[PDB]
Amino acid sequence: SSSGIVLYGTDLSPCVRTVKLTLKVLNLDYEYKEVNLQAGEHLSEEYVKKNPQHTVPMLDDNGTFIWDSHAIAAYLVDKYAKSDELYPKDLAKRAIVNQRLFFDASVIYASIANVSRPFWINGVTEVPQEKLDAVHQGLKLLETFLGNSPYLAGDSLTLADLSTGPTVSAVPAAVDIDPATYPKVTAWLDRLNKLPYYKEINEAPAQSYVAFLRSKWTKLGD
Amino acid sequence: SGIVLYGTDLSPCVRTVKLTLKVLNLDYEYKEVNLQAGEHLSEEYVKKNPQHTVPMLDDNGTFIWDSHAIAAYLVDKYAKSDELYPKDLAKRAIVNQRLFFDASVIYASIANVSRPFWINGVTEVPQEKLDAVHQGLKLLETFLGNSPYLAGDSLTLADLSTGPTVSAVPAAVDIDPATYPKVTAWLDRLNKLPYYKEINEAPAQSYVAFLRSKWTKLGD
Ligand SMILES: N[C@@H](CCC(=O)N[C@@H](CSO)C(=O)NCC(=O)O)C(=O)O
Ligand SMILES: N[C@@H](CCC(=O)N[C@@H](CSO)C(=O)NCC(=O)O)C(=O)O
């Protein structure tokens, strides 16, 4: 690419896919640098100098290095979008989208990372019931947030959906999202998948991740 | 002002918003929400905030929640200058990263400890949960580096959000100054601001003493 934008990532990370989705909706070219987490490429001296959290995604926008999928997506829309539909400039509307992003970070992501991180770090394959309960609590809140609106922040697709949709696509690694229990979540996930660019970026990597972790568990709750 | 804050003082998330209101010199009405009586679960409350959390802000008929979202709103709407939440997009991205780090790492690590207590009366804390809190502090220590504040040389929303959250962490973990000298020094630095100590310190001590009195097992 000649945009000067570089994304450091791996496709099985939902946080990375948030950024790919954002770059796609903004029609931005970029260079994608695959970071091999299994080889510890995120822990190298040169990587950690740019991102001391040693996470993906990281964005290099023409010499400006930023990380955290939420912060990256908000930056990209404000800098590069031609309209504000994904991330409204109106302060009250922006506060709704921000709230949903902080909910993804603090509740949805946190609940599923609580399950997966012990696996990646310490090979833990036994998942306490308490952790599955916390995932369900987050799904119930999402179900209520969706209400009668098609998207997470209202009638239009926003960064709220591009952030939370991928995270929720990882949840089935640990919990079944039963449509009869979570019909609004289910309908929303299906609605996102009706957007070709979304399904193309999200669906196969999400399936790969879920199948992988489901093959690992030796005990899933009580 | 027509601004109303719904909250309780022992919540660090609520204190973030009180600190923001204070630095912006905004007058407001403080409506205490009695979480122990379930006032956050009433029909009227959940109609405005389906997450049934504090803080919630009513800015003249606009209801918003989540301390990070509230604080960002308040600075962009009401501040004279953008020092707490820069308009430059790269600087904003650093402050936002810090806020999302507070939400996804620091807050999540300590809520993982406290929530089972408040919901189910769990008083036995697995070592894994304490390890997660330490991992978050280690990252914070690296973020601080040699800069006095979390996002660099000036105080920002990064500090007003993360400082109060970190003031709750001693409920479960000791913040050892030999392991976390920069975190320690930063927490002391915030407390040298009179408005910060006045809002934060006594409620933080109350919370920490309360939960420390309840634990029957703290890790291994
Ligand atoms: N709040 C951040 C989370 C990034 C993250 O956990 N990334 C994982 C990959 S999986 O989704 C990662 O980089 N793990 C390596 C590590 O933390 O060491 C964001 O939204 O970008
Ligand atoms: N990400 C949100 C966290 C709010 C929260 O959990 N608040 C607690 C009080 S402790 O700090 C609360 O309202 N608990 C009641 C509940 O969730 O039912 C924010 O920053 O505002």
Author numbering:
A (entry chain A): 2 to 223
B (entry chain B): 4 to 223
Article, verbatim:
The crystal structure of DmGSTE1 was solved at 1.80 Å resolution in the P212121 space group. The asymmetric unit contains one dimer of DmGSTE1. Each subunit adopts the typical GST fold with an N-terminal thioredoxin domain (β1α1β2α2β3β4α3, Ser2-Tyr88) and an all-helical C-terminal domain (α4α5α6α7α8, Pro89-Asp223). The glutathione binding site (G site) is occupied by a mixture of glutathione and glutathione sulfoxide refined with equal occupancies. The sulfur atom of the reduced form of glutathione is oriented towards the solvent, while the sulfoxide group of the oxidized form establishes a hydrogen bond with the Ser14 sidechain. This Ser14 is part of the catalytic motif ‘SPCV’ at the N-terminal end of helix α1 of DmGSTE1. Interestingly, the Cys16 residue part of this same catalytic motif is oriented toward the solvent and could be responsible for the thiol transferase activity observed with HED, as observed previously for other Ser-GSTs harboring a Cys in the catalytic motif. The clasp residue around the axis of the dimer was Phe103, as predicted from the sequence alignment. Both Phe103A and Phe103B interacted by Π-Π stacking, similar to GST Delta, while most GST Epsilon structures had a His. In summary, the overall assembly was stabilized by a combination of polar interactions surrounding the hydrophobic core of the dimer with the clasp Phe103 as a central and crucial anchor point.
